[PDB]
Amino acid sequence: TTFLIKHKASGKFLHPYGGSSNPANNTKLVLHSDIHERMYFQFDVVDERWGYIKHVASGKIVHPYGGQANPPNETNMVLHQDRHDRALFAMDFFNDNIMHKGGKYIHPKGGSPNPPNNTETVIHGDKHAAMEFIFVSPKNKDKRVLVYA
Amino acid sequence: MTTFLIKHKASGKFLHPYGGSSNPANNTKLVLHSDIHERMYFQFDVVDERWGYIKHVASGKIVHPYGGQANPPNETNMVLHQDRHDRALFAMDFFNDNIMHKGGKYIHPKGGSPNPPNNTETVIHGDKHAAMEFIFVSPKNKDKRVLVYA
Ligand SMILES: C=CCO[C@@H]1O[C@H](CO)[C@@H](O[C@@H]2O[C@H](CO)[C@H](O[C@H]3O[C@H](CO)[C@H](O)[C@H](O)[C@H]3O)[C@H](O)[C@H]2O)[C@H](O)[C@H]1O
Ligand SMILES: C=CCO[C@@H]1O[C@H](CO)[C@@H](O[C@@H]2O[C@H](CO)[C@H](O[C@H]3O[C@H](CO)[C@H](O)[C@H](O)[C@H]3O)[C@H](O)[C@H]2O)[C@H](O)[C@H]1O
Ligand SMILES: C=CCO[C@@H]1O[C@H](CO)[C@@H](O[C@@H]2O[C@H](CO)[C@H](O[C@H]3O[C@H](CO)[C@H](O)[C@H](O)[C@H]3O)[C@H](O)[C@H]2O)[C@H](O)[C@H]1O
Ligand SMILES: OC[C@H]1O[C@H](O[C@@H]2[C@H](O)[C@@H](O)[C@H](O)O[C@@H]2CO)[C@H](O)[C@@H](O)[C@H]1O
Ligand SMILES: OC[C@H]1O[C@H](O[C@@H]2[C@H](O)[C@@H](O)[C@H](O)O[C@@H]2CO)[C@H](O)[C@@H](O)[C@H]1O
């Protein structure tokens, strides 16, 4: 299932910075209001809830920068081609968050409910309304879709 | 598939049709029991994103609140029934470890015991606590969580 990763508070979406069909390794993942095929994602299940968040256009997946199992707060989120257990996430569609294997979450850097375009995303352990994400149809940005298959 | 056991987290007991039949009559109660066998296997049939039917594999019947209300009151018995409709929609919350009916209440052991005896009935109730938690595990390994969504 293909989906958009929608920041719940702002309605902006996760994008590779620059919007490329083939972002280089270590391109930062930002929030941006645009919708297009280079911000579509899929989720590749590895072990029950845990899997890879895949950028559809490039096949690269989401990593904490440097590939930590326990990335510190403020570690940047990036795309990278590699596959390993430090790039595992769970797409929590009940609590509306994205949790890294180490137990922290994807946040907008700074924690704004309304981050401007091109705000970087980071790992942070805090839970609040401004780190919530929902997973929606590329044809209807208000319709949640099931990311697990 | 995916086929799974519905395991009451606090006690390790499993959801069964009372009696363990391969073809339970409509309105057979769903109870907790320690036994493992093919007549307590379930599958989840997705209808709308998180919402779907909890299907008894042996019979094809599905989990309902008795009476099929949109908003069943607390203590309404859980049963199996052949019918499909929107009052038999549940979500399998494998993050918070519970099973929520479309009306917003959860599946509980009747009376709230965390160590209920065999044949304890299950019911709808709105409360959230450790004794209403469930996990979804492999029929071949009751300690291994499996993904129920597909
Ligand atoms: C000023 C009016 C005309 O120019 C507009 O200026 C914008 C600057 O405010 C430009 O937007 C920028 O366009 C870049 C690509 O040329 C980048 O946009 C890409 O990357 C984004 C994610 O970082 C999104 O995916 C976006 O869809 C994608 O095109 C840059 O991020 C963006 O600010 C642009 O020249 C034009 O709209
Ligand atoms: C001759 C120089 C040796 O380095 C080579 O080139 C790259 C340096 O640009 C190396 O890649 C870098 O390796 C780092 C680990 O030492 C980082 O890679 C880690 O983090 C990534 C996510 O940011 C991935 O998770 C990756 O799997 C993980 O190892 C850095 O990001 C990466 O560019 C390369 O190892 C080497 O061949
Ligand atoms: C010290 C001896 C006391 O135990 C006696 O033997 C039975 C165990 O086989 C006790 O259990 C009851 O067995 C019933 C069928 O004979 C029912 O079991 C069936 O349904 C269960 C779900 O409700 C399970 O699916 C089980 O696998 C299935 O066989 C009854 O539920 C069970 O309590 C009996 O109470 C006792 O006399
Ligand atoms: O970056 C995500 C976090 O943003 C806010 O924390 C700020 C600031 O970003 C951080 O550098 C600082 O150390 O703490 C600040 C506390 O105001 C949010 O408050 C956090 O919950 C994260 O979302
Ligand atoms: O119990 C689940 C079913 O509830 C309702 O039917 C009840 C009862 O089960 C049935 O035997 C009786 O004859 O009718 C009642 C409804 O008035 C639902 O209408 C069924 O679809 C099942 O949900």
Structure tokens at A67: 């590939």
* Residue among B49, B93, B146 minimizing CB distance to A146: B49
Cα–ligand 2 centroid distance for A46 (angstroms): 23
CATH 3.40.50.2300 matches A1-149: no
Q: Which of A77, A105, A109 to mutate to test the pocket of ligand 4 (most atoms within 8 A of CB)?
A: A109
Q: Give CA B102 to chain center in angstroms.
A: 13
Which of B122, B119, B124, B110 lies closest to B18, judged by CA? B119
For this PDB entry, the determination method is X-ray
| Nearest-neighbour CA in chain A from B125: distance (Å) | 19
Q: Quote helix, strand, coil % in chain A, to nearest 5.
A: 5, 45, 50
CA atoms within 13 A on the CB side of B55: 19
**Topology of domain B1-150, CATH:** Trefoil (Acidic Fibroblast Growth Factor, subunit A) (2.80.10)
* Residue among B49, B91, B147 minimizing CB distance to A45: B147
3-state secondary structure chain B: CCCEEEEECCCCCEEEECCCCCCCCCCEEEEEECCCCHHHCEEEEEEECCEEEEEECCCCCEEEECCCCCCCCCCCEEEEECCCCHHHCEEEECCCCEEEECCCCEEEECCCCCCCCCCEEEEEECCCCHHHCEEEEECCEEEEECCCCC
Q: Where are the domains of chain B?
A: 1-150
Residue nearest to atom 9 of ligand 5 (CA): B67
Q: Does the annotation list B36 as a binding residue?
A: yes
CB A63 within 8 A of CB A78: yes
